[PDB]
Amino acid sequence: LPASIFRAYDIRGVVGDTLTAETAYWIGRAIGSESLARGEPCVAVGRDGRLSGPELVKQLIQGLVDCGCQVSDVGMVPTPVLYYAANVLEGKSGVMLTGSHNPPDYNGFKIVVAGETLANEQIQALRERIEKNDLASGVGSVEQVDILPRYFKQIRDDIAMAKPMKVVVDCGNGVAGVIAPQLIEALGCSVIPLYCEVDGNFPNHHPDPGKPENLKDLIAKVKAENADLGLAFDGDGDRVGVVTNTGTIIYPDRLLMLFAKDVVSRNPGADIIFDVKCTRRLIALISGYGGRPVMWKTGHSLIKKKMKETGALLAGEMSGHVFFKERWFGFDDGIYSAARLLEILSQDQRDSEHVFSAFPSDISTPEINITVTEDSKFAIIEALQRDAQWGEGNITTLDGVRVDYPKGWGLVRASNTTPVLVLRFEADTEEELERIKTVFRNQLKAVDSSLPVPF
Numbered sequence: 001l002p003a004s005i006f007r008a009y010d011i012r013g014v015v016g017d018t019l020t021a022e023t024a025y026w027i028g029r030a031i032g033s034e035s036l037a038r039g040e041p042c043v044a045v046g047r048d049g050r051l052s053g054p055e056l057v058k059q060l061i062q063g064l065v066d067c068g069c070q071v072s073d074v075g076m077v078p079t080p081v082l083y084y085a086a087n088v089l090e091g092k093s094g095v096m097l098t099g100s101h102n103p104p105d106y107n108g109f110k111i112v113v114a115g116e117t118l119a120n121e122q123i124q125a126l127r128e129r130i131e132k133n134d135l136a137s138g139v140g141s142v143e144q145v146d147i148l149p150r151y152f153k154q155i156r157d158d159i160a161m162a163k164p165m166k167v168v169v170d171c172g173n174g175v176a177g178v179i180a181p182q183l184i185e186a187l188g189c190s191v192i193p194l195y196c197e198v199d200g201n202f203p204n205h206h207p208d209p210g211k212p213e214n215l216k217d218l219i220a221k222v223k224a225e226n227a228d229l230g231l232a233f234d235g236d237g238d239r240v241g242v243v244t245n246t247g248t249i250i251y252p253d254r255l256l257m258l259f260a261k262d263v264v265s266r267n268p269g270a271d272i273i274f275d276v277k278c279t280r281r282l283i284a285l286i287s288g289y290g291g292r293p294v295m296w297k298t299g300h301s302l303i304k305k306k307m308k309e310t311g312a313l314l315a316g317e318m319s320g321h322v323f324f325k326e327r328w329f330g331f332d333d334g335i336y337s338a339a340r341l342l343e344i345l346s347q348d349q350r351d352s353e354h355v356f357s358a359f360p361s362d363i364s365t366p367e368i369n370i371t372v373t374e375d376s377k378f379a380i381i382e383a384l385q386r387d388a389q390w391g392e393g394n395i396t397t398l399d400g401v402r403v404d405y406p407k408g409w410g411l412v413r414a415s416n417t418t419p420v421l422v423l424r425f426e427a428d429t430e431e432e433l434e435r436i437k438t439v440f441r442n443q444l445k446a447v448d449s450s451l452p453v454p455f
């Protein structure tokens with residue numbers, strides 16, 4: 001199999017190119033073998049609404065069965081519903097067949113084995129099992145499990161909306177359409193659906209709420225319908241995007257401020273995790289409410305591992321993966337997070353625009369991406385970590401280099417999903433924003449004067 005599909009957080013490829021039915025089978029065999037090695041014969045399997053789902057999921061299941069595993073086939077569900085299954089069924093292992101927010105032809109595997117979400121060397125270990133034929137053999141079984149109603153009920157029973165809300169819900173023709181509009185209605189909302197038909201061709205916009213262009217239709221509908229809030233889900237439902245009644249995009253780091261206040265209010269001293277892409281304003285906010293802010297690496301699998309390490313009750317990423325442990329299970333879930341948000345907003349007499357505008361804000365850049373090579377991106381970062389000079393500030397090298405100054409911050413890191421360098425800048429004035437950008441531009445140039453600096 002191609003090595004390129006085995007990434008830091010999960011397995012991801014293009015069907016008909018780097019991913020085939022045969023690939024899914026052997027990946028199934030590798031996951032089954034690892035699960036068995038960890039004492040777990042029971043594995044849940046889910047798939048999103050992609051065109052290739054039916055073909056690949058059958059092979060993934062057969063690979064697991066051929067290890068001797070007992071598979072629980074939960075059918076077509078959002079990613080968090082698969083994670084849910086791997087928390088409430090007999091087994092603590094689960095595999096989700098998903099291409100996340102990517103174009104129609106993409107697919108992949110998100111993997112939990114004996115409670116732990118695999119990343120880094122563990123994903124490489126799967127690749128290595130297949131190369132070595134270090135694989136279990138046995139006569140397993142498959143049982144169909146209808147888990148969506150249990151998930152639905154578990155959320156509905158945990159949430160208490162104080163007053164009715166009107167909410168536009170954009171599923172991007174992804175799999176969140178199987179539950180999100182129905183569940184949000186059941187919580188006590190009027191729901192205006194947008195692109196909620198599950199359609200793996202994604203004929204409307206990419207199901208990627210992290211890009212403002214993909215929220216354009218949502219913003220317009222919120223305004224046209226006088227809605228209280230707009231919500232968007234990514235293709236597999238583990239990311240959420242948020243729009244106020246006035247059409248303001250609420251980025252996930254600011255969403256996390258509202259959630260952090262909520263969680264810490266009931267859990268003094270709770271650890272709250274956020275990734276290196278999130279606003280410095282989060283650090284002060286969590287600390288002020290008596291929480292312990294923990295900055296960590298970008299990447300859903302890595303955040304999940306850190307949750308376990310720290311006992312954190314809540315985590316969030318700038319990309320919109322939000323992880324509730326309090327009242328929940330600790331995995332990322334856009335649908336649950338949407339429910340938690342609606343609960344909080346419903347208990348405030350103010351509109352969603354004013355609830356969010358109350359929090360301090362910096363001036364933030366849109367994300368900067370610089371295309372480099374897959375085989376040079378980590379070396380550029382290593383070079384910066386070795387050689388760079390940042391002036392006076394708090395320097396963090398846990399993921400790339402982030403520097404926090406008195407009045408702003410900057411970040412450069414390697415993407416683990418694309419051959420690019422990712423940069424973020426934010427400051428409380430335009431002047432400071434430019435000063436920080438200049439520092440970073442000069443440090444990049446000092447490593448390699450030929451690097452593009454599109455900022």
Ligand SMILES: O=P(O)(O)O[C@H]1OC[C@@H](O)[C@H](O)[C@H]1O
Nearest residue numbers: 299300317319415416417418
């Ligand atoms: O390409 P990366 O930045 O490495 O990862 C992205 O895709 C995975 C998400 O968990 C991250 O938050 C998102 O930023």
Ligand SMILES: [Zn+2]
Nearest residue numbers: 100234236238
């Ligand atoms: Zn996703």
